[PDB]
């Protein structure tokens, strides 16, 4: 069956890429490995 | 007479053995209620 | 020697440059 | 300078045996049919 | 074809081409040895490799 | 000691739930089956 | 004595002699830096 | 009508359940300090 | 119809992922391989075996992260988990590089498995196994630097480290060492590497700017029907423009698509071929005849002379760090310097 | 075609979502627990920030051994007190 | 036609002319040992085992004969030094000509085998076809092997009716060739162990030969026989070139890393001899027993023989040389003449500084001295403007001991700095570089070609293997694809079973 | 004995170079009819 | 281009082959003493 | 390198032998 959209499924994934990527590339400034 | 490095030889025998054992007995037990009809 | 043999292998190379492209094996439709 | 007395005769071995192996092979398929 | 003295000798030996046993055959049985075979290079790989240690097998150069 | 098991009942109600929802449907999947 | 039932002719054709030629030249264009040495 | 669990379903969790496990622990790792 | 006939029908069946008999040895070893070194990269240290960080939870990141090698003590053993050196203990088993050997073999008969999936699924379709002939050329190449290169040296400690950077390291480490580029054997793998690129964007580039119209959409896609008989571009035109552009071209499309097959695949052969002889350190490193002049002739520069000054550099500068176990101790007078720098 | 369900008939059903929903944050939490806590510096034997070198201690607790391995490892742990 | 690579196949069905050409091949290969052993004995220097062995003139199959009893030449000279032998007939010029005479006798039988082809042996009865029951040849040539492989180890390897074998002590010092007898119990599994090898032929022997009577008069099954083509002879092909570079890798690592048939004076020390320091704690560990029975340095220094002192220095490690370096070892740094000694460094304070040795890895390699903790105190500097280390600012001095230079202590920095040059090799010896024109460049030993070739030629024969291995499962599809398949046999979940139409 | 260098390759392209040209024409004519 | 009337085939046979590989063979066994002196 | 070149041309010269004997062309009359 189709009763939730892709594209709105193809849109929270996606997004859900993004915060996690992003939580990565943050990290990469602070804490261990941040040469600081 | 038997070193513990002839030990643990027998260890990682009987250990594949097992995985080798369990591998056929469930594919085995897979294959006979799963037949192929002709 | 050496100049001379590495002269002598790089002509023969030019050399079959000319063969290969003018003295080509004719491409033919059938 | 100081090479290697037969490079010479080793380089002239390695391009004329295997050329002449190819060209006897094909001045005998031009000769036939 | 040709004969001769010799191939005849021989021509038993050259003969039962393509004649076979029924079914599998001694193809169990065949599989065990390849097992005892298997676990034989096993050992002396180990042994080599120094991860089986045996008592009086010094795998060196002084012996 | 006991983080050997703070960490896996997540797995294990991850799991759990997992089992209720859909048994329904999956004892007529080997029901079928046999 | 009979002909042999087991034999056939060889070819090579021009393609393969220019492809042959090139592969043996700069093979040997390669090497001889090292044969000399 | 389709069934529920195949070979493939096994294929899928093999790696979509480690992978989810490990994706929690790298994100925990951006909060460690020295 | 016994109990291998049967066992025979289920392995292969035509699911959405074929399993055969390859795939009871493929699919476990390459499943712990693989994720051998996503636990490795992600958790295990190598701070024991080379003094280094190469894992998520201590600070590196994709680039940096590693599954090290074992340290230099540990020679050529296999480190099995119950074997003398670990002696059952997972969490020493990962301290000295048990993972390193852990993914080294079982990702070798993954790649077996992988061949004899190409074998198996060639002959049920009922096509030609050249797609496995060709896998040969990367089983060889892994083969032969991964394995029979730590063999020929000291130990595993020597072998690439499975990691982006730690692959870097082992790009320079032969430069410096082994002057890898000079060698001629790595000469013929990089024509066959950039010769294979060079076929697959120029054959690619042909076909699709020789198309016929077979469609009315500016977007030519979706003219091709898998069924058809016909082919999709002209031979003949093709032919013709690289016969006047180049000088040669194709006219023949079964010779064309095996050379295609040809070219790299020899190419990776020829460099498996190059590291086998530096596991003996049969290296392709000087030229006698330059280095005995330049000894007396101070005034004699090449290009070949300028570039081992910097593997004497490399090796000098690098070696304390990267081989620990040796004990290195270089003095600042010692250290091969230009001028100012 | 093979008979299997399609993923974009599973993705996009309720029932995927019924129970997937707290699949994914519960072993997403899994991964967690296991740093914050800090198991997995003890399963692994990775060092603490705190646990690289001793105060003066500068030199590498490098591997010298082979069959006592695990033996000078555990010395150089026991140096950390 | 036939292209170029498929000439050879015209005896696939020709039995007569296929055992021809394996005539031809055998009778060259022979030829070869006989053509190389007479260079290497026109070229070979017998007048000193001890610095000038085989192994340092690029001997290849010198040691070859010498493994398994053959030593002396209808020269008068043995290779152990001995002078005064009668080897009878059976010495090195001897077996070349019998490796010479044997190749032309081959060459003369594959001529028969080749006019004489049409033979009625060759040819199925039943079919009047060429046909060759490979099981039952399989069975009969195991069982020679058997029997040939018991016998060599029964009478050949014992010394019951032979030689026997080359053994030698751990530090490769005293080789002879003796009878060996087998040692049948877990020692027996030693790579280091002489009677291993002797048990191996007697015992794999017997084996031979229980399966080569197995293999005659029992058929194969009739799947195996299916399934792996017991009809068409490539099928052979495959196997054997599988079981050639399995044993090609075998012979390339116990050559590279060291057994009891790759002794150390017929092809040379190991590369890991020189990483575990193997000869210089020997050399060491008889210093001090000298010295502890009340011998002066100058004496426990000279109870070194030249022969140990030759082993522990790195021109001799296999791992030193190059890809295009030929020739022998005596080309590189020159022929050896005598040990010059063993040197030992003091500064002024009188301490004694060590030479840190070069790897294996290195081309170059710095001079550094430490102590005997290994404190630098000495080196060669590069940039001197900051030196702290310089051999002239901390008085460094050479002394000798033993060899040439016994006694001899110098004090120059130019001389000293000549002496911790060269002991980063090892012990130091003179050379003549005079004689060969020697370059002054490492080379590699016998024991590295080896290597070196048989496995390059091992890696080679993987692909031998798959290729005529998928000649023989793949022999319908060799010339393409079935030219009516259709969308069918290859649509997905139509046939239950890949590729079977007997499930729709 | 010390001999000439050039005297090696100058027996072998010697023999080899006339020795190739027989051989080819004969090959060549074989395959005829 | 239409095809030159004035081309004719080559032949050597087997005998006049043995008869040059032996002129050859023989002019370098006596001048080989002389080419290396 | 003198008497290994001296002997191949002597060896190349008895196999020319062999040859020009036991594979001749047969002379056939007619
Ligand atoms: C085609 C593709 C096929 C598909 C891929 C399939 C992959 C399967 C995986 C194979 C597993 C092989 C592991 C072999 C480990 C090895 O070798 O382990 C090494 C050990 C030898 O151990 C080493 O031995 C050395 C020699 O020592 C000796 O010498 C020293 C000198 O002082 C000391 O005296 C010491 O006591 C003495 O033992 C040192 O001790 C090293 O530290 C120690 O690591 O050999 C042994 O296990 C056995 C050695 C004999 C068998 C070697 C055959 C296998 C290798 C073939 C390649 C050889 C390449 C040669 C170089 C080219
Ligand atoms: C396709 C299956 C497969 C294969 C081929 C391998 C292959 C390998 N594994 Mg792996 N492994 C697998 C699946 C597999 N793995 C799975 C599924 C797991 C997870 C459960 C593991 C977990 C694992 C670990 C943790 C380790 C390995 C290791 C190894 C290596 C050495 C194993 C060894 O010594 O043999 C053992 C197996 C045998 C000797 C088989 C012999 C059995 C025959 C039939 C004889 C029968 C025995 C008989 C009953 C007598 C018993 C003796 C008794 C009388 C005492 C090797 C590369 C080691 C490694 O690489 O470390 C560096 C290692 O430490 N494996
Ligand atoms: C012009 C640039 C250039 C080019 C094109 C090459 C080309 C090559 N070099 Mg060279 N190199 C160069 C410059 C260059 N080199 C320079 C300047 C240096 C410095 C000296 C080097 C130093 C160097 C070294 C030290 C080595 C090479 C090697 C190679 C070969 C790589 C073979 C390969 O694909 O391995 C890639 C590996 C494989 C194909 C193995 C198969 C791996 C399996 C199939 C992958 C399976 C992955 C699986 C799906 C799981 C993935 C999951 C993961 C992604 C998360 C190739 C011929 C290697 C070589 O010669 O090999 C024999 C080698 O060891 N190079
Ligand atoms: C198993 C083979 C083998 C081995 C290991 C040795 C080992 C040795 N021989 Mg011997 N030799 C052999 C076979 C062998 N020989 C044969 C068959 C002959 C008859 C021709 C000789 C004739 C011979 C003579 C006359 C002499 C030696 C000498 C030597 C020594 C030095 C070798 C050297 O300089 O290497 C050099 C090796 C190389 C430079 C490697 C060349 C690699 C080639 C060029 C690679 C080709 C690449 C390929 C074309 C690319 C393919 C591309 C692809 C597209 C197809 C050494 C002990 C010398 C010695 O010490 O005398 C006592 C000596 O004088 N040998
Ligand atoms: C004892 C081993 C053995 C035997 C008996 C055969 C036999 C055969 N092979 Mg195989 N092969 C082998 C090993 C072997 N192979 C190995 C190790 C490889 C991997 C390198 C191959 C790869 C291979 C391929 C890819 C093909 C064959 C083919 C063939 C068939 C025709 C060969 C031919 O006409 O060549 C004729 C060869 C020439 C006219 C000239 C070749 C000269 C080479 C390039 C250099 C000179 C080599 C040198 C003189 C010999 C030294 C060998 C020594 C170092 C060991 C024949 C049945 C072909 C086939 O299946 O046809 C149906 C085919 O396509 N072979
Ligand atoms: C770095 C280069 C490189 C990579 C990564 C690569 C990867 C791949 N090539 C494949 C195929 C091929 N490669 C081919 C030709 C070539 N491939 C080349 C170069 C590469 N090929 C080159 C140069 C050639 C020309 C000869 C052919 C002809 C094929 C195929 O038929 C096949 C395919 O279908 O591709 C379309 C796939 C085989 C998958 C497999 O075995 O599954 C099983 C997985 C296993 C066994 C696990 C591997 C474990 C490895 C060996 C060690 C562990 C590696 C870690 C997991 C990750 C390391 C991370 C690094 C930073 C170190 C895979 C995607
Ligand atoms: C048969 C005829 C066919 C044509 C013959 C063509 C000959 C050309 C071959 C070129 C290679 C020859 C090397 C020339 C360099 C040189 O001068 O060598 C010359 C060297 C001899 O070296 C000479 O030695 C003398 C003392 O006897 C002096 O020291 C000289 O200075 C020194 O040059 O010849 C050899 O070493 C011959 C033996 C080579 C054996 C190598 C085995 C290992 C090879 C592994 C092969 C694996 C490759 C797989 C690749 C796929
Ligand atoms: C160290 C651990 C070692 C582990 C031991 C070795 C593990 C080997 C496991 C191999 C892969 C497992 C496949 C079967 C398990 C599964 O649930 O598949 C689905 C099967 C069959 O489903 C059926 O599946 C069929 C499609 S398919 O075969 O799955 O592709 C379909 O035709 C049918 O309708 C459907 O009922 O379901 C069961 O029968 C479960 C009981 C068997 C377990
Ligand atoms: C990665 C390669 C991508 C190449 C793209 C080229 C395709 C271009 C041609 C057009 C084809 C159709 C358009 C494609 C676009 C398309 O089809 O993609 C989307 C595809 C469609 O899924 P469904 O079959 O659910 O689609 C609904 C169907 O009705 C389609 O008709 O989804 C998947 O197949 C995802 C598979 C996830 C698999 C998870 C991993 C499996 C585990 C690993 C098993 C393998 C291990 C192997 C060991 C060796
Ligand atoms: C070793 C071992 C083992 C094994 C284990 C395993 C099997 C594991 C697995 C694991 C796994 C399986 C894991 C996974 C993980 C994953 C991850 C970690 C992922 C990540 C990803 C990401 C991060 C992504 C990214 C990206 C990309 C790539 C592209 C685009 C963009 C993005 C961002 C999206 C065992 C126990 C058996 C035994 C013992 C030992
Ligand atoms: C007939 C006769 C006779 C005679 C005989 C003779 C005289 C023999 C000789 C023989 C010989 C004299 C032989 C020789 C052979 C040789 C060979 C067979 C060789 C080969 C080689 C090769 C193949 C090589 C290759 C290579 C190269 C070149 C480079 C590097 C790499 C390689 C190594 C691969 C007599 C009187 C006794 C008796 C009666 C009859
Ligand atoms: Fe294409």
Same mark, same amino acid.
């Given at each position: 069956?189709?009763?939730?959209?892709?594209?709105?499924? &193809?849109?929270?994934?996606?997004?859900?890429?993004?915060?996690?990527?992003?939580?990565?590339?943050?990290?990469?400034?602070?804490?261990?490995?941040?040469?600081? | 007479?038997?070193?513990?490095?002839?030990?643990? @030889?027998?260890?990682? *025998?009987?250990?594949?053995? $097992?995985?080798?054992?369990?591998?056929?007995?469930?594919?085995?037990?897979?294959?006979?209620?799963?037949? #192929?009809?002709? | 020697?050496?100049?001379?043999?590495?002269?002598?292998?790089?002509?023969?190379?030019?050399?079959?440059?000319?063969?290969?492209?003018?003295?080509?094996?004719?491409?033919?439709?059938? | 300078?100081?090479?290697?007395?037969?490079?010479?005769?080793?380089?002239?071995?390695?391009?004329?045996? =295997?050329?002449?192996?190819?060209?006897?092979?094909?001045?005998?398929?031009?000769?036939?049919? | 074809?040709?004969?001769?003295?010799? +191939?005849?000798?021989?021509? =038993?030996?050259?003969?039962?081409?393509?004649?076979?046993?029924?079914?599998?055959?001694?193809?169990?049985?065949?599989?065990?040895?390849?097992?005892?075979?298997?676990?034989?290079?096993?050992?002396?790989?180990?042994?080599?490799?120094?991860?089986? !240690?045996?008592?009086?097998?010094?795998?060196?150069?002084?012996? | 000691?006991?983080?050997?098991?703070?960490?896996?009942?997540?797995?294990?109600?991850?799991?759990?739930?997992?089992?209720?929802?859909? *048994?329904?449907?999956?004892?007529?999947?080997?029901?079928?089956?046999? | 004595?009979?002909?042999?039932?087991?034999?056939?002719?060889?070819?090579?054709?021009?393609?393969?002699?220019?492809?042959?030629?090139?592969?043996?030249?700069?093979?040997?264009?390669?090497?001889?830096?090292?044969?000399?040495? | 009508?389709?069934?529920?669990?195949?070979?493939?379903?096994? &294929?899928?969790?093999?790696?979509?359940?480690?992978?989810?496990?490990?994706?929690?622990?790298?994100?925990?790792?951006?909060? !460690?300090?020295? | 119809?016994?109990?291998?006939?049967?066992?025979?029908?289920?392995?292969?069946?035509?699911?959405?992922?074929? $399993?055969?008999?390859?795939?009871?040895?493929?699919?476990?070893?390459?499943?712990?391989?693989?994720?051998?070194?996503?636990?490795?990269?992600?958790?295990?240290?190598?701070?024991?075996?080379?003094?280094?960080?190469?894992?998520?939870?201590?600070?590196?990141?994709?680039?940096?992260?590693?599954?090290?090698?074992? &340290?230099?003590?540990?020679?050529?053993?296999?480190?099995?988990?119950?074997?003398?050196?670990?002696?059952?203990?997972?969490?020493?088993?990962?301290?000295?590089?048990?993972?390193?050997?852990?993914?080294?073999?079982?990702?070798?008969?993954?790649?077996?498995?992988?061949?004899?999936?190409?074998?198996?699924?060639?002959?049920?379709?009922?096509?030609?196994?050249?797609?496995?002939?060709?896998?040969?050329? =990367?089983?060889?190449?892994?083969?032969?630097?991964?394995?029979?290169?730590?063999?020929?040296?000291?130990?595993?400690?020597?072998?690439?480290?499975?990691?982006?950077?730690?692959?870097?390291?082992?790009?320079?480490?032969?430069?410096?060492?082994?002057?890898?580029?000079?060698?001629?054997?790595?000469?013929?793998?990089?024509?066959?590497?950039?010769?294979?690129?060079?076929?697959?964007?120029?054959?690619?580039?042909?076909?699709?700017?020789?198309?016929?119209?077979?469609?009315?959409?500016?977007?030519?896609?979706?003219?091709?029907?898998?069924?058809?008989?016909?082919?999709?571009?002209?031979?003949?035109?093709?032919?013709?423009?690289?016969?006047?552009?180049?000088?040669?071209?194709?006219?023949?499309?079964?010779?064309?698509?095996?050379?295609?097959?040809?070219? =790299?695949?020899?190419?990776?052969?020829?460099?498996?071929?190059?590291?086998?002889?530096?596991?003996?350190?049969?290296?392709?490193?000087?030229?006698?005849?330059?280095?005995?002049?330049?000894?007396?002739?101070?005034?004699?520069?090449?290009?070949?002379?300028?570039?081992?000054?910097?593997?004497?550099?490399?090796?000098?500068?690098?070696?304390?760090?990267?081989?620990?176990?040796?004990?290195?101790?270089?003095?600042?007078?010692?250290?091969?310097?230009?001028?100012?720098? | 075609?093979?008979?299997?369900?399609?993923?974009?008939?599973?993705?996009?059903? #309720?029932?995927?979502? #019924?129970?997937?929903?707290?699949?994914?944050?519960?072993?997403?939490?899994?991964?967690?627990?296991?740093?914050?806590?800090?198991?997995?510096?003890?399963?692994?034997?990775?060092?603490?920030?705190?646990?690289?070198?001793?105060?003066?201690?500068?030199?590498?607790?490098?591997?010298?051994?082979?069959?006592?391995?695990?033996?000078?490892?555990?010395?150089?742990?026991?140096?950390?007190? | 036609?036939?292209?170029?690579?498929?000439?050879?196949?015209?005896?696939?069905?020709?039995?007569?002319?296929?055992?021809?050409?394996?005539?031809?091949?055998?009778?060259?290969?022979?030829?070869?040992?006989?053509?190389?052993?007479?260079?290497?004995?026109?070229?070979?220097?017998?007048? /000193?085992?001890?610095?000038?062995?085989?192994?340092?003139?690029?001997?290849?199959?010198?040691?070859?004969?010498?493994?398994?009893?053959?030593?002396?030449?209808?020269?008068?000279?043995?290779?152990?030094?001995?002078?005064?032998?009668?080897?009878?007939?059976?010495?090195?010029?001897?077996?070349?000509?019998?490796?010479?005479?044997?190749?032309?006798?081959?060459?003369?039988?594959?001529?028969?085998?080749? $006019?004489?082809?049409?033979?009625?042996?060759?040819? /199925?009865?039943?079919?009047?076809?060429?046909?060759?029951?490979?099981?039952?040849?399989?069975?009969?040539?195991?069982?020679?092997?058997?029997?040939?492989?018991?016998?060599?180890?029964?009478?050949?390897?014992?010394?019951?009716?032979?030689?026997?074998?080359?053994?030698?002590?751990?530090?490769?010092?005293?080789?002879?060739?003796?009878?060996?007898?087998?040692?049948?119990?877990?020692?027996?599994?030693?790579?280091?162990?002489? +009677? +291993?090898?002797?048990?191996?032929?007697?015992?794999?022997?017997?084996?031979?030969?229980?399966?080569?009577?197995?293999?005659?008069?029992?058929?194969?099954?009739?799947?195996?026989?299916?399934?792996?083509?017991?009809?068409?002879?490539?099928?052979?092909?495959?196997?054997?070139?599988?079981?050639?570079?399995?044993?090609? @890798?075998? #012979?390339?690592?116990?050559?590279?890393?060291?057994?009891?048939?790759?002794?150390?004076?017929?092809?040379?020390?190991?590369?890991?001899?020189?990483?575990?320091?193997?000869?210089?704690?020997?050399?060491?560990?008889?210093?001090?027993?000298?010295?502890?029975?009340?011998?002066?340095?100058?004496?426990?220094?000279?109870?070194?023989?030249?022969?140990?002192?030759?082993?522990?220095?790195?021109?001799?490690?296999?791992?030193?040389?190059?890809?295009?370096?030929?020739?022998?070892?005596?080309?590189?740094?020159?022929?050896?003449?005598?040990?010059?000694?063993?040197?030992?460094?003091?500064?002024?304070?009188?301490?004694?500084?060590?030479?840190?040795?070069?790897?294996?890895?290195?081309?170059?390699?710095?001079? !550094?001295?430490?102590?005997?903790?290994?404190?630098?105190?000495?080196?060669?500097?590069?940039?001197?403007?900051?030196?702290?280390?310089?051999?002239?600012?901390?008085?460094?001095?050479?002394?000798?001991?033993?060899?040439?230079?016994?006694?001899?202590?110098?004090?120059?920095?130019?001389?000293?700095?000549?002496?911790?040059?060269?002991?980063?090799?090892?012990?130091?010896?003179?050379?003549?570089?005079?004689?060969?024109?020697?370059?002054?460049?490492?080379?590699?030993?016998?024991?590295?070609?080896?290597?070196?070739?048989?496995?390059?030629?091992?890696?080679?024969?993987?692909?031998?293997? !798959?290729?005529?291995?998928?000649?023989?499962?793949?022999?319908?599809?060799?010339?393409?694809?079935?030219?009516? *398949?259709?969308?069918?046999?290859?649509?997905?979940?139509?046939?239950?079973?890949?590729?079977? $139409?007997?499930?729709?």
């Amino acid at each position: 069956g189709g009763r939730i959209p892709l594209w709105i499924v &193809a849109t929270v994934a996606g997004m859900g890429v993004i915060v996690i990527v992003g939580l990565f590339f943050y990290g990469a400034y602070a804490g261990l490995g941040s040469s600081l | 007479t038997i070193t513990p490095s002839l030990k643990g @030889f027998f260890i990682g *025998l009987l250990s594949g053995a $097992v995985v080798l054992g369990l591998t056929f007995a469930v594919l085995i037990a897979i294959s006979q209620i799963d037949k #192929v009809q002709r | 020697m050496e100049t001379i043999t590495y002269v002598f292998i790089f002509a023969c190379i030019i050399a079959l440059f000319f063969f290969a492209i003018f003295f080509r094996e004719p491409p033919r439709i059938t | 300078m100081e090479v290697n007395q037969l490079g010479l005769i080793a380089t002239a071995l390695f391009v004329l045996v =295997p050329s002449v192996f190819l060209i006897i092979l094909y001045v005998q398929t031009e000769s036939q049919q | 074809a040709r004969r001769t003295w010799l +191939g005849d000798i021989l021509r =038993p030996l050259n003969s039962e081409y393509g004649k076979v046993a029924p079914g599998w055959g001694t193809t169990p049985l065949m599989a065990v040895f390849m097992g005892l075979f298997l676990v034989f290079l096993l050992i002396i790989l180990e042994i080599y490799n120094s991860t089986l !240690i045996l008592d009086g097998v010094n795998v060196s150069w002084k012996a | 000691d006991w983080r050997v098991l703070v960490v896996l009942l997540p797995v294990l109600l991850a799991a759990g739930w997992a089992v209720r929802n859909i *048994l329904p449907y999956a004892v007529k999947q080997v029901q079928k089956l046999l | 004595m009979e002909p042999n039932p087991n034999r056939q002719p060889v070819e090579l054709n021009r393609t393969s002699l220019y492809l042959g030629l090139l592969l043996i030249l700069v093979l040997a264009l390669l090497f001889s830096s090292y044969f000399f040495n | 009508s389709y069934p529920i669990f195949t070979v493939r379903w096994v &294929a899928v969790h093999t790696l979509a359940v480690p992978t989810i496990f490990f994706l929690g622990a790298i994100a925990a790792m951006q909060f !460690i300090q020295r | 119809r016994g109990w291998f006939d049967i066992l025979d029908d289920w392995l292969k069946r035509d699911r959405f992922v074929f $399993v055969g008999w390859s795939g009871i040895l493929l699919f476990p070893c390459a499943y712990l391989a693989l994720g051998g070194w996503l636990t490795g990269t992600t958790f295990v240290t190598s701070w024991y075996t080379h003094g280094l960080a190469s894992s998520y939870l201590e600070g590196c990141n994709f680039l940096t992260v590693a599954v090290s090698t074992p &340290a230099n003590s540990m020679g050529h053993s296999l480190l099995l988990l119950w074997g003398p050196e670990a002696q059952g203990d997972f969490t020493r088993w990962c301290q000295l590089g048990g993972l390193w050997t852990f993914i080294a073999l079982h990702g070798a008969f993954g790649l077996i498995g992988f061949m004899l999936r190409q074998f198996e699924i060639a002959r049920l379709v009922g096509v030609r196994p050249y797609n496995a002939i060709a896998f040969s050329a =990367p089983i060889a190449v892994f083969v032969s630097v991964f394995l029979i290169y730590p063999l020929g040296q000291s130990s595993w400690f020597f072998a690439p480290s499975f990691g982006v950077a730690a692959i870097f390291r082992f790009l320079l480490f032969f430069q410096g060492f082994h002057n890898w580029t000079l060698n001629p054997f790595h000469m013929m793998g990089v024509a066959g590497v950039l010769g294979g690129a060079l076929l697959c964007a120029i054959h690619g580039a042909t076909v699709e700017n020789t198309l016929f119209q077979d469609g009315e959409g500016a977007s030519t896609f979706r003219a091709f029907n898998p069924t058809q008989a016909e082919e999709t571009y002209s031979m003949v035109t093709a032919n013709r423009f690289w016969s006047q552009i180049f000088g040669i071209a194709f006219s023949n499309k079964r010779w064309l698509h095996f050379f295609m097959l040809f070219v =790299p695949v020899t190419g990776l052969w020829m460099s498996a071929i190059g590291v086998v002889g530096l596991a003996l350190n049969l290296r392709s490193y000087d030229f006698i005849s330059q280095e005995i002049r330049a000894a007396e002739d101070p005034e004699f520069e090449t290009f070949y002379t300028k570039n081992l000054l910097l593997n004497e550099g490399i090796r000098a500068w690098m070696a304390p760090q990267d081989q620990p176990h040796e004990n290195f101790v270089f003095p600042e007078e010692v250290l091969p310097r230009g001028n100012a720098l | 075609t093979t008979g299997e369900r399609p993923f974009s008939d599973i993705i996009t059903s #309720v029932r995927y979502w #019924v129970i997937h929903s707290i699949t994914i944050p519960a072993l997403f939490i899994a991964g967690w627990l296991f740093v914050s806590t800090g198991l997995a510096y003890d399963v692994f034997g990775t060092p603490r920030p705190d646990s690289y070198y001793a105060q003066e201690q500068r030199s590498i607790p490098l591997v010298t051994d082979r069959f006592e391995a695990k033996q000078q490892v555990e010395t150089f742990l026991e140096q950390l007190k | 036609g036939l292209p170029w690579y498929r000439v050879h196949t015209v005896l696939i069905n020709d039995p007569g002319r296929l055992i021809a050409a394996h005539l031809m091949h055998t009778a060259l290969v022979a030829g070869w040992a006989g053509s190389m052993a007479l260079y290497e004995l026109a070229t070979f220097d017998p007048s /000193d085992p001890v610095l000038n062995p085989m192994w340092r003139q690029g001997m290849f199959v010198l040691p070859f004969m010498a493994r398994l009893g053959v030593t002396g030449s209808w020269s008068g000279w043995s290779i152990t030094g001995e002078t005064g032998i009668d080897p009878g007939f059976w010495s090195f010029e001897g077996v070349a000509l019998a490796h010479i005479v044997l190749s032309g006798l081959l060459f003369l039988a594959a001529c028969w085998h080749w $006019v004489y082809w049409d033979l009625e042996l060759f040819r /199925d009865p039943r079919t009047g076809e060429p046909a060759l029951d490979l099981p039952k040849m399989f069975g009969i040539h195991l069982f020679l092997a058997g029997l040939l492989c018991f016998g060599f180890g029964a009478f050949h390897l014992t010394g019951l009716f032979g030689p026997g074998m080359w053994v030698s002590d751990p530090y490769g010092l005293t080789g002879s060739v003796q009878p060996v007898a087998p040692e049948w119990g877990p020692d027996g599994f030693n790579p280091y162990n002489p +009677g +291993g090898v002797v048990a191996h032929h007697i015992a794999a022997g017997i084996v031979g030969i229980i399966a080569g009577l197995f293999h005659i008069l029992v058929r194969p099954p009739q799947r195996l026989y299916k399934a792996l083509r017991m009809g068409n002879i490539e099928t052979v092909l495959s196997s054997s070139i599988a079981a050639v570079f399995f044993a090609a @890798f075998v #012979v390339a690592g116990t050559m590279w890393y060291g057994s009891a048939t790759t002794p150390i004076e017929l092809f040379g020390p190991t590369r890991y001899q020189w990483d575990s320091s193997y000869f210089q704690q020997e050399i060491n560990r008889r210093v001090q027993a000298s010295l502890a029975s009340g011998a002066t340095l100058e004496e426990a220094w000279s109870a070194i023989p030249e022969k140990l002192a030759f082993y522990d220095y790195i021109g001799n490690n296999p791992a030193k040389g190059g890809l295009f370096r030929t020739g022998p070892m005596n080309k590189g740094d020159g022929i050896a003449q005598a040990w010059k000694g063993h040197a030992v460094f003091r500064n002024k304070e009188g301490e004694e500084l060590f030479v840190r040795r070069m790897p294996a890895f290195f081309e170059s390699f710095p001079v !550094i001295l430490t102590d005997k903790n290994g404190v630098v105190k000495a080196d060669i500097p590069f940039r001197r403007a900051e030196s702290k280390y310089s051999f002239e600012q901390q008085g460094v001095t050479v002394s000798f001991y033993g060899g040439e230079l016994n006694g001899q202590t110098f004090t120059d920095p130019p001389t000293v700095k000549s002496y911790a040059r060269k002991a980063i090799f090892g012990e130091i010896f003179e050379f003549d570089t005079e004689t060969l024109n020697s370059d002054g460049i490492f080379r590699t030993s016998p024991r590295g070609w080896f290597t070196f070739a048989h496995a390059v030629f091992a890696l080679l024969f993987f692909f031998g293997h !798959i290729w005529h291995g998928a000649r023989t499962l793949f022999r319908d599809v060799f010339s393409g694809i079935d030219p009516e *398949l259709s969308p069918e046999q290859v649509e997905w979940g139509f046939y239950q079973k890949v590729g079977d $139409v007997t499930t729709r």
